[PDB]
Amino acid sequence: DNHLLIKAVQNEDVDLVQQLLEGGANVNFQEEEGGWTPLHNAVQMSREDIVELLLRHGADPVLRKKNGATPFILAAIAGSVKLLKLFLSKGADVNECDFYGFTAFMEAAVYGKVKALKFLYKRGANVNLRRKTKEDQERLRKGGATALMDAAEKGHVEVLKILLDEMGADVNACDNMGRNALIHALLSSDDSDVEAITHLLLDHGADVNVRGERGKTPLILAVEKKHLGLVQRLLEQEHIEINDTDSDGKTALLLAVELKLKKIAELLCKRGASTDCGDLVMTARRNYDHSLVKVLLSHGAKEDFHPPAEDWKPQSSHWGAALKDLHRIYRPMIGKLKFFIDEKYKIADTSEGGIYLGFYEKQEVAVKTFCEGSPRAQREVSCLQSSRENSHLVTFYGSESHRGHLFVCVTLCEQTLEACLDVHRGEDVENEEDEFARNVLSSIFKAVQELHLSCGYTHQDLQPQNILIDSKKAAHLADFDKSIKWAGDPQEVKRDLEDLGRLVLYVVKKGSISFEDLKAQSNEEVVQLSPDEETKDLIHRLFHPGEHVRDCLSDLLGHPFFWTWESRYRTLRNVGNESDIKTRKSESEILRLLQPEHSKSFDKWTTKINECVMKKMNKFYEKRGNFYQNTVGDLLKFIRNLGENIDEEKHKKMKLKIGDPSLYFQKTFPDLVIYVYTKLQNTEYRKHFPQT
Amino acid sequence: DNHLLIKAVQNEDVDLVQQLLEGGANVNFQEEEGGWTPLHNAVQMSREDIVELLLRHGADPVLRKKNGATPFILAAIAGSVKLLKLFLSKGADVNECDFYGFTAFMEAAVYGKVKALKFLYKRGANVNLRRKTKEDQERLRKGGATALMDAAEKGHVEVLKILLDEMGADVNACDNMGRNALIHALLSSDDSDVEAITHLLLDHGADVNVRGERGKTPLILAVEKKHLGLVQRLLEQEHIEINDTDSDGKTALLLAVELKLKKIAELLCKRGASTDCGDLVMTARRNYDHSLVKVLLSHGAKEDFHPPAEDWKPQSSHWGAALKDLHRIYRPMIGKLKFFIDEKYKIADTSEGGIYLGFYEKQEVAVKTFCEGSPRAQREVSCLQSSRENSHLVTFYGSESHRGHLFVCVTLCEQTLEACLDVHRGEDVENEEDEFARNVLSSIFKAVQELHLSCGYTHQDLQPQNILIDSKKAAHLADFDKSIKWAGDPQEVKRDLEDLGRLVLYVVKKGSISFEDLKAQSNEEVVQLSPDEETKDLIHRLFHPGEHVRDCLSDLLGHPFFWTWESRYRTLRNVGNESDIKTRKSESEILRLLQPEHSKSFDKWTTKINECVMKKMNKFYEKRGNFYQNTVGDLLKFIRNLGENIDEEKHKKMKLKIGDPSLYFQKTFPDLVIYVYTKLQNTEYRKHFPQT
Ligand SMILES: Nc1ncnc2c1ncn2[C@@H]1O[C@H](COP(=O)(O)OP(=O)(O)O)[C@@H](O)[C@H]1O
Ligand SMILES: Nc1ncnc2c1ncn2[C@@H]1O[C@H](COP(=O)(O)OP(=O)(O)O)[C@@H](O)[C@H]1O
Ligand SMILES: [Mg+2]
Ligand SMILES: [Mg+2]
Ligand SMILES: [Mg+2]
Ligand SMILES: [Mg+2]
C-alpha cells in the first residue's frame, strides 16, 4: 500500500502515477532495502516526464538513497543530459559524490555515457578526483580510483580517448591499492577492447612497471591472458621489468611455460627474460613440448631444479613414509590440495573412490573422494560444514572440486578403532583396568551429543571402522556421507543410540565380537551379553532413555562405567562414612533408600567374605557385641572401615589376603557399584559421587 | 652417474650417447620419478637416430614407464609416423594403452598430430574406444573419454573433421561422467576454435541436451562464455531444452541476466525461455539496466521475488538482530562468504579494516579484513592454517580474496573477556568462590600450550581484548596477526608466559585493574599484587619456569589455583588422615617433609582459632593428655578430624561457629593450601591431591 507509487513509476504507468499523486500519495517515500524513492526510479529509467511530474508534486530533488547517491548522480548513469541539466538547476553540485566517493563524472565513465561525460566536463566536473570513501574501507586500501580507471576497466574506448585527449586526465594516477588505469584494464574480465585500451594508455605514457593486487604486473597479466598481441606491445616498452615476480614468486616467463604458451615464452626469452625463474625446462618436458625445451635451453635454463630448502617432517608415524614421497614428487595443484590418486597413497577404498593422503594447505590430511553431485557427497559436506564447532569430530580442512569430482579434506589419523584394539587385545592378557575403553567411549559420546544437539545432525553409521585414532591416542568421529539433518524424528535418534550401546560392548570386549553380528542380535541380547554390571546398566540406559531423550547422554557421562576403580572405591567408602550408617538408625533416610530383587551379590555378604579378615574386623565391636549384619548398610560400613585402617602400620596381613582393595570389593560383589548408584541417583547423597 | 646417459640423450649429444653406450652404460635404466628410460626421452624428442642407436645397444622397445606408456604411445604424442612404424615392427600393438587407458590414437588426437592419426587409423586403430582406467578412478566416474572428445577439448579442428568425416567417430559418445564431445569443447579453456568445433559437432548431429560436471548444459556454458554466436547456433537446434538448470538451480536466462548480458538474455527470451527462473527483474535493476528490465517484463517476469522458505534462526544472542537483516538483504557473494562492510554489521574497527558479521557457508561467522599482501594478513592466516587441530583456539572457517583484500572467516563469539567480567564485577559483590576465573584460565592455558607445542607458534599478544566468550559461556583464544613461528627462541616463549601471568591477575581481580598498566609494572610487582596465595604462587611459577620451560604449562594445570574449594578441603583432610600424623612419629617421612620461613600463617595456629571449637575438640584427648600442638602436622590432623565428625548429629553448634568449613580454614590460614602443595609436590603423598 505504501509501495503503490514506486511500483507505478517502475511500470511507467504515467496515468496511474498522476492518479496516485493527486490522491495524496507520499512523493518522498523510501523503500527499506536501499532507500529508493519514486524519483530515483524515474531517473534510473531515464523518464524526464515522470521526473517532472514527481517534482511538481513536491519531490525532494536532492534526497539521497542509502548509498548516498543523488538523483543527479543517477542521471549520469542513465546518460541523460536533460536530467543532469535539471538537477543542476535544482541545487545539485557538479562534484557531489555518494558515500563511496562516486561522482556523476565517474558514473558517466563507468557506464560509457559520452554525451553526459562531455556535458559534465563543461559544467565544471573534476576529471582527476580519486574516490574518497569511509575510513573503514580505506584501511583495506579500498578507494582512490578515477574516471579514467573506470572507463579502462569497463572497456569504453571512446570515453578513454576523450578523457586523455580532450579532458586532461592523469594517465598514471593510482588508487589506494596502487593500481593505475593500465592495470585496471588488464585485471578486468571485459576483454573485448583490452587491445585498443592498452595501446591507447601506453601511447599516452602509461607506466608498465606497476603492481596489481597479487604482485601482478601488466606483463604478467597479459601472459596469463594468453594474449600474444598484448605481450608484444607491452614488450616494446623500452624499460619494462621482465623479471618481476607475483606474490607466488612466479615470473612472466615461468607462467608462460606453465600455461603451455610456447610463442609467448619464446618472445620473453628473446627480449631477455632470465631463465632462473624456477622449474622451467622440467615443466616444458612434463607438458611434452620439446620445441619449448630447446628454446629454454639455448637461452640458458637450468637442467636440475632443487626446490627451496623447505624444512618439513611428517607428523604421522603410520603414514609419513608415504607422505615424504608425496611431498617430494611433482603434482599439479587442485586449488589448495596436493595429492595423487594412486595405490601408493591410498589408505582405503570407498564407494565413490577412496581415501588418500594429501596436503591441503601444506598440512597433511586425509582426502575423501566423491562424484560431486552424488547424495553421499552432499551428505558428508553438508554435515561437515555445520559441525566445525564440534571438537570431538574429525576436523574439516576444506574441499576442492575438479571435474565433477569432490575432494573432501579432513584431519589425518593413524588407524581405526578396530585396528587399534586388535593390538590392545593381544597384549592385555591381564585382568587389568581398561582405561582406554573409558576415555575413548566418553570422547565418542561427546561427539554424538554435540552432533545431535549442537550440529543438528544424526550420524546413522556408528561403527568401529568410522572411529579414528590419533597418534596420542585420542579418538575421533568420522564418515558422514550417511548423515540426516532433522533429529526431530525420534526413530533416527534412537537408531544412533542403539548403535552406541552395541559399540560400548564392542570396546569393552576389546573387539573380540565383530560389530556386524552385534547388530544382528537384538538390543536385549546385547544387554544380557555385557560382562560387568557397569556396562550392563550403561547400554541398558542407552536402549531405554527417559522422557527427554535429549538429556540422556550428558547424564550417562556421570555413570559408574566412566568412574575409575579408585573413584568407585573412594565413593563407596564415602557413603559408608555416613553417621546414620555407623550408628544404625531406623528413621534414617539413607538406610530406607538402600533397602530393597531377591537375587543379589550382597544379600548375605558376611559369608561371601574370607572370612579371616572378617573376624579380625569384628573384634573391633566385640565389647558391646555390635557385630556386622547382612544389610546393605553394614557392607558399606565395612568398606569405609577396612579401607581406612588398611593404610595404618599393623595391617600388612590384611593387604596380602585382600590384594588391591578397590579391586577385591568389585570382584566378590559386582552388583554393588551399580546398586548404590541406582538408589542414590537423585538424592542429596550425590555429593559422595565423584565429579563427572 | 647413473643419469649420464639419460642426460646425454636429453641434450641430443649423439656422440656422447654413442660414447656412453659403448662404454657399458645401462641402456634400460629408469629414473625414479616417472620410470623414464633413455629411449622414452629419445622418442619424446622425436629423434629417430638416437632411438635407433639406443635400440642397437639393446634397448627394450616395449618397456613402459610408471604411467604404463610405451615408446610407441610416446611416438604418437611426438607425431612421428616413422617411430610408430618402427615400434609396430618391434612388437607394439596398435590398440595398446597406458594405465589410464590412453591409446596412441587418442594421444595423436590430444596433441593434434594429423599424419600420425591418419597412419594409426590405417594400421587398424580403434577410433571409438572409451578410456578404461583403474577401478579407483572409475568409482569417481573418471575415464570413458574418446579421441573425438580430446580433439574437441584441445580445439583441433582438422583432426575433428577427419574423425567425423573419414574415420567414423561416434559423435554422441559419452564418458563416465556423461560428457560428450560437445560438452568437452564448451568446458575447455582453449576457446580459440570453439565456434568452429561447435558448428561441426552440431551439424554432425551432436546432442545439445546433455549435462556437464555441475549440471551445466551446452547452452548454459555458452551463456557463461558470454559468447553470443555460440548461443545463437545452439538456439537454432529445434529441440534444445532452454529451461534446464545447473546444480545451483540457475537457468541459462538467469545466468545471462546476472552476467549483465542483455543481448543474450533477450535472445533467450525471444526463443521462449520461461521468466520464472528467480530474481530476474530485480537483478537487472541492481545492475542499472532498464533496457533489460523492459525486455524481461514484456516476456512476463515476476515483480516481487520471495526467496525459498529457508528455515533459519541466528544462533547468537548479542548479534543475531543484525544477522537476521544481513541474512535477508541482497548481497553479492565473495566465494562462499556473504557479508557487508558497513557500520551496521561492524563489530570492531581494526588496523586493516575491521571485524564484521557474515555467513561463510551459510554459517554465521566473524569476518576479519586485511590488505592481502600485508605482514599482518599472512601472520594471521599462516597461524590459522597450522592450528586447526587446536580445540581451544577460535576455529578457522576459511578465507576469501577479492581485489587484494583478504577476508578471514572465523567463529563468531558474543563478547571479549573485558566486556564479560565487567558485568560479572557488578554482580559478584559477594566473597564467593570464583568458578568462572578457573574454567576460563584453564581453557586459555590449554590454548597457549597447544599453540607453542602442537601448532608451533607464539601468540605475542595475550590480552583480554583477544579472549572471546561463547554464549555458554566458554572462552576462546583469537587474533593471530602478531604471531611468530619458531618457539626455539626462549625470549618469545617467555614473552608469552609473562603475559599469561599478568592475565591471571586480571581475571581473578575481575578486571578492576586495566591490562595496559599491568604490563607497565614489573613481573615482580605483579606477583606481590596477587590477592590469595594460590594465585600468588601460580603467576610466580609462570615468571620462573624450570629447566624445561616446555613442560611448565601442563604441570601448572595441576596447581591449587585450579582446585575447587571442596577439592582443597578434601585433600587437606586426606593428608591429615595419614596414620603417621595421628600417631605422631619421629622417623616419619611425611612429618619431616612438612617441617620448615619464620613468617607463616599457621606457626602458632591453636591461638588463631576461636577457640571454643578448639576446646571442644581437645576434650577428645583429655584422658592421655595428648592435646594439639602448634606443628603443621597437628593442624592437618585437626582439619581431618573436624571435617569428619561435623556431619554427625551432635554438631550443629560447630556448624554455626565455623560456617562453611572449606571456606573457614582457608580464611584464617591462606598460607596453608600452597604450603602443603609446595612440600608434597614430588612425593608418593601426591595421591591425596585431586585428579587434574
Ligand atoms: N581422516 C582419516 N584418517 C585415517 N583414516 C581414514 C580417515 N578417513 C577415512 N579413513 C579410512 O577410510 C575408511 C573409509 O572412510 P569412510 O569415511 O568411512 O568412507 P565410507 O563412507 O565409504 O565408509 C575408514 O574406515 C578409515 O579406515
Ligand atoms: N570471532 C569473533 N567474535 C566476536 N568478536 C570478535 C571476533 N574476532 C574479533 N572480535 C572483536 O574484534 C576485536 C579486534 O579483533 P582482533 O582479531 O583482535 O584484531 P587486532 O589484531 O586488530 O586486535 C576484538 O577485540 C574483538 O572484540
Ligand atoms: Mg564408514
Ligand atoms: Mg559412510
Ligand atoms: Mg587484538
Ligand atoms: Mg592483533
XYZ file of C-alpha atoms in Angstrom, chain A residues 159-666:
508
model
C 35.369 7.563 -23.409
C 39.047 6.822 -22.772
C 40.177 8.822 -25.817
C 38.076 11.764 -24.666
C 39.464 11.621 -21.125
C 43.077 11.586 -22.329
C 42.907 13.848 -25.395
C 40.154 16.337 -24.548
C 39.799 16.421 -20.750
C 43.349 16.220 -19.369
C 43.109 13.011 -17.328
C 46.144 11.848 -15.340
C 47.112 8.609 -17.093
C 49.420 7.423 -14.301
C 47.105 8.116 -11.365
C 46.949 5.255 -8.857
C 44.226 4.138 -6.447
C 44.737 3.243 -2.778
C 45.849 -0.240 -3.856
C 48.469 1.272 -6.158
C 46.643 0.275 -9.335
C 46.698 2.627 -12.323
C 44.375 2.601 -15.344
C 46.553 0.164 -17.302
C 46.423 -2.400 -14.501
C 42.649 -1.912 -14.183
C 42.096 -2.707 -17.857
C 44.256 -5.832 -17.719
C 42.629 -7.014 -14.478
C 39.149 -6.669 -15.973
C 37.101 -9.637 -17.185
C 35.747 -7.458 -20.001
C 38.447 -8.360 -22.538
C 36.528 -7.119 -25.598
C 38.571 -3.947 -26.174
C 41.630 -4.589 -23.999
C 43.978 -4.392 -27.006
C 42.851 -0.915 -28.033
C 42.741 0.292 -24.429
C 46.270 -0.960 -23.746
C 47.779 0.699 -26.829
C 45.942 3.943 -26.051
C 47.261 4.091 -22.497
C 50.822 3.054 -23.378
C 50.952 5.649 -26.158
C 49.836 8.273 -23.641
C 52.780 7.342 -21.429
C 51.152 4.849 -19.051
C 53.560 3.176 -16.625
C 54.151 -0.518 -17.353
C 56.030 -1.299 -14.145
C 53.222 -1.117 -11.590
C 51.870 -3.809 -9.265
C 48.341 -5.199 -9.015
C 46.527 -6.990 -6.191
C 48.645 -10.163 -6.211
C 52.047 -8.847 -7.277
C 50.641 -8.947 -10.791
C 52.377 -6.657 -13.271
C 50.750 -5.706 -16.598
C 53.152 -8.098 -18.336
C 52.227 -10.998 -16.057
C 48.541 -10.229 -16.641
C 48.983 -10.321 -20.424
C 50.814 -13.641 -20.160
C 48.006 -15.061 -18.031
C 45.519 -13.763 -20.605
C 47.386 -15.913 -23.147
C 47.302 -12.789 -25.317
C 50.289 -12.648 -27.682
C 49.455 -9.196 -29.052
C 49.275 -7.652 -25.587
C 52.605 -9.218 -24.631
C 54.108 -7.961 -27.895
C 53.020 -4.358 -27.317
C 53.994 -4.431 -23.633
C 57.446 -5.752 -24.538
C 58.007 -2.858 -26.949
C 58.260 -0.587 -23.912
C 61.998 0.038 -23.646
C 62.109 -0.100 -19.835
C 59.621 -2.805 -18.844
C 60.770 -5.031 -15.960
C 60.538 -8.533 -17.438
C 61.779 -10.364 -14.330
C 59.181 -9.106 -11.833
C 57.521 -11.843 -9.777
C 53.945 -12.006 -8.484
C 53.017 -12.909 -4.896
C 53.775 -16.575 -5.600
C 57.294 -15.644 -6.697
C 56.430 -16.643 -10.263
C 57.828 -14.597 -13.151
C 56.148 -13.874 -16.502
C 58.269 -16.474 -18.319
C 57.600 -19.184 -15.742
C 53.878 -18.531 -16.003
C 54.114 -18.609 -19.799
C 55.759 -22.037 -19.542
C 53.280 -23.436 -17.010
C 50.421 -22.177 -19.179
C 51.862 -24.046 -22.173
C 52.403 -20.844 -24.182
C 55.420 -21.513 -26.416
C 55.238 -18.400 -28.610
C 54.915 -16.074 -25.625
C 57.626 -17.909 -23.667
C 59.973 -17.675 -26.654
C 59.226 -13.962 -27.052
C 60.075 -13.290 -23.411
C 63.291 -15.260 -23.907
C 64.271 -13.251 -26.984
C 63.541 -9.986 -25.168
C 65.933 -11.221 -22.484
C 63.967 -12.736 -19.615
C 66.253 -14.577 -17.191
C 65.833 -18.356 -17.181
C 66.387 -18.832 -13.445
C 62.699 -18.475 -12.589
C 62.106 -21.999 -11.357
C 61.367 -25.395 -12.876
C 61.485 -24.084 -16.460
C 62.839 -26.975 -18.557
C 61.250 -29.730 -16.494
C 57.829 -28.066 -16.744
C 58.089 -27.981 -20.536
C 59.026 -31.670 -20.595
C 56.084 -32.616 -18.376
C 53.829 -30.879 -20.899
C 55.610 -32.736 -23.721
C 56.882 -29.626 -25.513
C 60.432 -30.293 -26.725
C 60.271 -27.266 -29.007
C 59.868 -25.129 -25.894
C 62.525 -27.212 -24.125
C 65.070 -26.466 -26.856
C 64.292 -22.745 -26.733
C 64.672 -22.602 -22.948
C 67.985 -24.481 -23.101
C 69.548 -22.204 -25.711
C 68.580 -19.256 -23.511
C 70.408 -20.917 -20.626
C 67.835 -22.593 -18.373
C 68.982 -24.908 -15.560
C 68.737 -28.675 -16.041
C 68.087 -29.875 -12.488
C 65.779 -27.958 -10.180
C 66.217 -28.393 -6.444
C 63.226 -26.735 -4.671
C 63.760 -24.206 -1.832
C 65.097 -25.692 1.415
C 61.646 -26.182 2.956
C 62.098 -27.716 6.400
C 59.447 -30.410 6.794
C 58.902 -33.609 8.755
C 55.658 -35.588 8.574
C 53.676 -35.702 11.820
C 52.196 -39.165 11.252
C 54.053 -42.363 12.156
C 51.951 -44.962 10.323
C 51.929 -42.882 7.167
C 54.695 -40.312 6.765
C 56.895 -42.777 4.914
C 54.445 -42.274 2.064
C 53.961 -38.607 2.996
C 57.660 -37.860 2.465
C 57.332 -39.192 -1.083
C 54.119 -37.306 -1.867
C 55.784 -34.168 -0.518
C 58.803 -34.701 -2.773
C 57.319 -35.753 -6.132
C 55.781 -33.306 -8.595
C 51.993 -32.985 -8.649
C 49.616 -30.467 -10.212
C 47.739 -28.472 -7.569
C 43.961 -28.669 -7.293
C 43.192 -25.410 -5.530
C 44.971 -25.773 -2.216
C 45.059 -29.583 -2.363
C 48.131 -31.563 -3.413
C 47.500 -35.293 -3.771
C 47.800 -38.327 -6.038
C 45.027 -40.831 -6.699
C 47.349 -43.833 -6.770
C 47.669 -47.121 -4.882
C 50.803 -45.957 -3.061
C 48.892 -43.116 -1.400
C 45.528 -44.824 -0.969
C 44.622 -45.618 2.617
C 41.228 -47.184 1.877
C 38.798 -47.873 -0.958
C 35.312 -46.344 -0.772
C 32.007 -46.241 -2.686
C 32.923 -43.234 -4.854
C 36.691 -43.623 -4.970
C 38.765 -43.906 -1.825
C 40.637 -42.178 0.966
C 44.070 -40.811 0.101
C 46.996 -38.966 1.654
C 47.325 -35.307 0.693
C 48.395 -31.789 1.627
C 45.566 -29.259 1.985
C 47.330 -26.042 2.988
C 50.801 -27.553 3.279
C 49.079 -29.574 6.026
C 48.956 -33.372 5.922
C 45.341 -34.529 5.613
C 43.189 -37.444 4.537
C 41.315 -36.900 1.274
C 37.884 -38.422 0.688
C 36.670 -38.563 -2.907
C 33.118 -38.350 -4.268
C 31.287 -37.837 -7.511
C 30.428 -34.177 -6.893
C 26.684 -34.422 -7.498
C 26.055 -37.622 -5.522
C 23.817 -37.829 -2.399
C 26.787 -39.198 -0.438
C 28.939 -36.244 -1.477
C 26.496 -33.617 -0.246
C 25.560 -35.541 2.901
C 29.192 -35.551 4.012
C 29.888 -31.945 3.021
C 26.616 -30.523 4.368
C 27.284 -32.210 7.706
C 30.938 -31.142 7.886
C 30.006 -27.526 7.141
C 27.521 -27.419 10.021
C 29.715 -29.071 12.653
C 33.004 -27.131 12.670
C 32.413 -26.260 16.329
C 32.331 -29.957 17.261
C 35.679 -30.682 18.934
C 35.239 -34.466 19.010
C 34.579 -34.822 15.301
C 37.225 -35.210 12.647
C 38.031 -31.600 11.747
C 37.119 -30.338 8.266
C 40.020 -28.630 6.466
C 38.193 -27.857 3.236
C 37.191 -29.216 -0.156
C 38.208 -28.855 -3.790
C 36.245 -29.620 -6.948
C 37.977 -30.532 -10.208
C 35.846 -32.031 -12.989
C 32.730 -33.201 -11.187
C 34.860 -34.905 -8.560
C 34.710 -33.712 -4.968
C 37.805 -33.938 -2.777
C 36.899 -33.527 0.892
C 39.972 -32.772 3.005
C 39.948 -33.866 6.621
C 42.327 -34.454 9.556
C 44.624 -37.442 9.062
C 44.518 -40.165 11.721
C 46.633 -43.259 12.402
C 44.116 -46.112 12.333
C 40.531 -47.138 13.033
C 39.133 -48.391 16.328
C 39.269 -51.975 15.031
C 42.930 -51.821 14.033
C 43.861 -50.270 17.378
C 42.165 -52.666 19.815
C 43.356 -55.615 17.736
C 46.817 -54.839 19.087
C 45.464 -53.972 22.540
C 43.701 -57.344 22.687
C 46.911 -59.296 22.118
C 48.734 -57.585 24.981
C 46.024 -57.157 27.635
C 46.045 -60.795 28.763
C 45.747 -59.320 32.268
C 42.643 -58.781 34.385
C 43.641 -55.116 34.372
C 41.511 -51.963 34.486
C 40.623 -50.837 30.965
C 41.384 -47.109 30.984
C 41.418 -46.955 27.180
C 37.810 -48.134 26.914
C 36.666 -45.248 29.116
C 38.426 -42.242 27.564
C 37.584 -43.450 24.048
C 33.887 -44.017 24.722
C 33.497 -40.769 26.672
C 35.091 -38.997 23.720
C 32.719 -40.620 21.220
C 29.683 -39.941 23.428
C 30.516 -36.231 23.316
C 30.740 -36.383 19.527
C 27.263 -37.871 19.118
C 25.919 -35.451 21.740
C 27.146 -32.287 20.015
C 26.188 -33.828 16.672
C 22.543 -34.294 17.663
C 22.148 -31.170 19.796
C 24.660 -28.556 18.600
C 25.177 -29.526 14.957
C 21.627 -30.756 14.415
C 22.575 -33.978 12.623
C 22.274 -37.741 13.094
C 25.222 -39.973 12.148
C 23.405 -43.169 11.056
C 26.607 -45.221 10.754
C 28.201 -45.649 14.168
C 30.704 -48.470 13.723
C 34.336 -49.189 14.690
C 35.550 -48.540 11.124
C 34.300 -44.950 11.403
C 36.071 -44.154 14.681
C 39.624 -42.984 14.032
C 42.537 -42.976 16.465
C 45.162 -40.249 16.917
C 48.868 -40.805 17.433
C 48.274 -39.925 21.094
C 45.991 -41.952 21.055
C 42.779 -39.897 21.093
C 39.539 -40.972 19.401
C 37.561 -39.033 16.773
C 34.250 -39.498 14.925
C 34.267 -39.579 11.105
C 32.465 -40.617 7.898
C 29.314 -38.537 7.439
C 28.049 -39.479 3.964
C 25.076 -41.218 5.600
C 24.043 -38.317 7.844
C 20.499 -36.955 8.127
C 19.518 -33.443 9.217
C 16.490 -33.005 11.496
C 16.773 -35.048 14.698
C 13.080 -34.389 15.306
C 12.103 -37.883 14.185
C 12.937 -39.931 17.311
C 13.483 -43.120 15.291
C 16.616 -41.590 13.760
C 17.988 -40.585 17.164
C 17.044 -43.986 18.573
C 18.837 -45.662 15.653
C 22.024 -43.791 16.569
C 21.629 -44.531 20.285
C 21.140 -48.294 19.983
C 24.167 -48.277 17.687
C 26.098 -46.633 20.526
C 25.105 -49.321 23.023
C 26.313 -52.064 20.698
C 29.535 -50.072 20.396
C 30.021 -49.988 24.170
C 30.076 -53.789 24.254
C 32.495 -53.761 21.318
C 35.221 -51.708 23.002
C 34.904 -53.306 26.455
C 35.206 -56.788 24.922
C 38.283 -55.425 23.114
C 36.677 -56.157 19.742
C 36.554 -59.936 20.158
C 32.974 -59.786 18.879
C 32.558 -58.381 15.362
C 30.279 -55.352 15.138
C 28.288 -56.805 12.239
C 26.674 -59.625 14.238
C 26.362 -57.360 17.269
C 23.898 -55.540 15.023
C 22.357 -58.918 14.177
C 21.306 -59.900 17.700
C 18.585 -57.880 19.440
C 19.269 -54.935 21.755
C 18.029 -57.221 24.524
C 20.553 -59.972 23.817
C 23.338 -57.384 23.714
C 22.409 -56.182 27.213
C 22.483 -59.708 28.638
C 25.828 -60.161 26.862
C 27.665 -57.415 28.782
C 30.478 -58.661 31.120
C 30.421 -56.385 34.196
C 27.385 -54.759 35.822
C 28.573 -51.239 34.987
C 28.393 -51.792 31.224
C 25.267 -53.876 31.772
C 23.397 -50.886 33.195
C 25.046 -48.411 30.804
C 23.964 -49.914 27.485
C 20.580 -50.702 29.034
C 20.050 -46.986 29.645
C 21.039 -46.276 26.036
C 18.263 -48.604 24.855
C 15.641 -47.089 27.157
C 16.190 -43.322 27.559
C 13.779 -41.285 29.687
C 11.010 -38.902 28.644
C 13.608 -36.454 27.359
C 15.893 -38.491 25.104
C 17.890 -35.281 24.661
C 19.251 -35.070 28.212
C 20.013 -38.802 28.190
C 23.635 -38.507 27.032
C 25.020 -35.861 29.371
C 23.586 -37.861 32.265
C 25.311 -41.031 31.082
C 28.710 -39.320 31.274
C 28.235 -39.437 35.049
C 27.656 -43.198 35.066
C 29.768 -45.647 37.169
C 31.117 -47.050 33.876
C 33.157 -43.879 33.412
C 34.350 -43.925 37.033
C 37.873 -45.175 37.722
C 38.316 -48.097 40.126
C 39.707 -45.720 42.747
C 36.709 -43.476 42.115
C 34.273 -46.352 42.656
C 36.320 -47.187 45.746
C 36.507 -43.687 47.232
C 32.770 -43.026 46.947
C 31.772 -46.389 48.413
C 33.917 -45.536 51.429
C 32.372 -42.061 51.468
C 28.792 -43.355 51.640
C 29.817 -45.855 54.309
C 31.173 -42.855 56.202
C 27.647 -41.561 56.824
C 26.900 -41.085 60.526
C 23.470 -42.678 60.140
C 25.023 -45.884 58.808
C 27.636 -46.391 61.540
C 25.111 -45.597 64.249
C 22.378 -47.604 62.503
C 19.100 -45.695 62.676
C 15.528 -46.795 61.963
C 14.288 -43.390 60.813
C 17.327 -42.866 58.568
C 16.515 -41.520 55.115
C 19.658 -43.084 53.654
C 19.037 -46.504 55.206
C 15.498 -46.857 53.830
C 16.734 -45.857 50.373
C 19.369 -48.607 50.384
C 16.722 -51.200 51.302
C 15.398 -53.468 48.505
C 15.322 -58.007 43.920
C 15.617 -61.361 45.683
C 18.703 -62.234 43.630
C 21.762 -60.141 44.545
C 25.501 -60.470 45.196
C 25.496 -58.989 48.696
C 22.327 -60.427 50.263
C 24.368 -62.395 52.805
C 27.768 -60.826 52.161
C 29.349 -61.750 55.510
C 29.585 -65.344 54.283
C 30.958 -64.268 50.900
C 33.993 -62.905 52.736
C 37.144 -64.869 53.549
C 36.500 -64.779 56.471
C 39.718 -64.437 58.496
C 39.711 -60.748 57.563
C 36.073 -60.600 58.670
C 36.748 -61.886 62.185
C 39.704 -59.529 62.602
C 37.409 -56.611 61.784
C 34.606 -57.900 64.018
C 36.944 -57.860 67.020
C 36.605 -54.068 66.993
C 32.992 -54.382 68.165
C 33.234 -57.439 70.424
C 32.642 -55.402 73.599
C 29.058 -54.241 73.021
C 28.580 -57.139 70.607
C 27.661 -54.826 67.735
C 28.810 -57.253 65.024
C 28.242 -56.752 61.291
C 24.928 -57.959 59.867
C 23.862 -58.805 56.305
C 22.314 -55.433 55.440
C 23.462 -53.203 52.576
C 24.361 -50.529 55.114
C 26.845 -52.618 57.088
C 28.607 -53.686 53.894
C 29.339 -50.036 53.139
C 30.239 -49.514 56.790
C 32.681 -52.384 56.339
C 34.189 -50.928 53.163
C 34.638 -47.492 54.751
C 36.169 -49.089 57.851
C 38.509 -51.513 56.073
C 39.909 -49.033 53.562
C 40.541 -46.546 56.358
C 42.817 -48.592 58.631
C 44.406 -50.600 55.801
C 46.977 -47.796 55.487
C 47.957 -47.885 59.176
C 51.071 -49.773 60.316
C 49.723 -53.012 61.783
C 47.980 -54.207 58.639
C 50.296 -55.918 56.168
C 48.476 -59.162 56.947
C 45.255 -57.725 55.519
C 46.969 -56.298 52.427
C 48.079 -59.713 51.154
C 44.808 -61.533 51.832
C 42.734 -58.853 50.094
C 45.139 -57.726 47.382
C 44.053 -54.426 45.868
C 41.048 -53.275 47.955
C 39.327 -51.339 45.160
C 39.581 -54.463 43.007
C 38.627 -57.083 45.610
C 35.325 -55.476 46.623
C 34.247 -55.275 42.981
